[PDB]
Symmetry: D2
């Protein structure tokens, strides 16, 4: 599992559950091509997005659909979604974990890259 996404709710101090996540890969014509997607689990995590074979070097975008998450909680948010855009590199460690910490008017995102 070379790509995992983890989402936390900073308002409730809890995993952000049932958050839609869409991954895209940049195509040769500079458009974003759908690559993988899912919803975060009860632990705020999304695994099984891709395989080692398919996750080749390239530019990827992870969209986390934060607005719909906050709307479900009755909380008015700022962002439409959190975006994380990066180049996958074979030189570095083999596992990427994209973490996101969400508040209504702020988010932070961190990449933890390990072997």
């Amino acid at each position: 599992c070379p790509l995992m996404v983890k989402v936390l709710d900073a308002v409730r101090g809890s995993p952000a559950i049932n958050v839609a996540v869409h991954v895209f890969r940049k195509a040769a014509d500079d458009t974003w091509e759908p690559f993988a997607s899912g919803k975060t689990s009860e632990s705020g995590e999304l695994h099984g997005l891709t395989t080692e074979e398919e996750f080749v070097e390239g530019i990827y975008k992870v969209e986390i659909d934060t607005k719909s998450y906050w709307k479900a909680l009755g909380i008015s948010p700022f962002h439409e979604h959190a975006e994380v855009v990066f180049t996958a590199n074979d030189s570095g460690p083999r596992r990427y974990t994209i973490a996101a910490l969400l508040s209504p008017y702020s988010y932070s995102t961190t990449a933890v890259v390990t072997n």
Copy 2:
């Protein structure tokens, strides 16, 4: 200004200076149209991107070119940019300050919204 972008460097404890910022607005055909752009000042701030007249209701994307910033300091960072996508002025005109705090493998983006 109705729209101001501020960028800070969490490694150096400084403003992030001369960072390129591109603003786009979503068109009726769902494409991202260019809206405004500039570079952060010595204070890490970018003012004068738009006017209250031109900054109508819509979905806007602020793209902060963080990779180029880090590379110039000798650092190879994780992200290509920091993106900030939001609906603006849907409840009438507001003033928006979009801040980003940058580290090589992490960033945070925050908005402060004030009613004139």
Copy 3:
């Protein structure tokens, strides 16, 4: 000012207003002595805590009373405060801006340090 504290609310996208801030300085006997205190303004900022004369080298603690802030908004938060502990002026006088961004179960604290 050589020391400025800024506090923002990540739930509302606003300054955090009227937040109590206590500054302490570590004494020779390793105790925390009171140094300055105040409350954030309508802009979420607290200026005028100290002077360049009084703000000597030392270890300082800035305690931001976040629990009381959240409780007044009807929220029961996780943290009692946000604490910010740092050595100041060890390489000569510097200007320090300490910011805190608050959510009920999370906060971030950042420093921007500039040489006069």
Copy 4:
């Protein structure tokens, strides 16, 4: 394991390894009494700090010794240490995870409280 601490390095995109962590509990005379301590593992985590029996309601402080971490990396940091002060509550979920994301001149800390 009712209390866990997890520390990440935002500069290197990696778990923050071998970081000293000291936990204190507030005594009746308002002093901080040493309660538990350890160093983060290769995964940036510290488990086994306390037990369900000993972790009673009260005010606790978790100090994360960030300055020594950065000094080891040759990076000049702002903070002496990251502090996290909170009241343990029996009404809520039974597990506290204190997470910290570290940069030289900034840190963020989040509590994830789950069952």
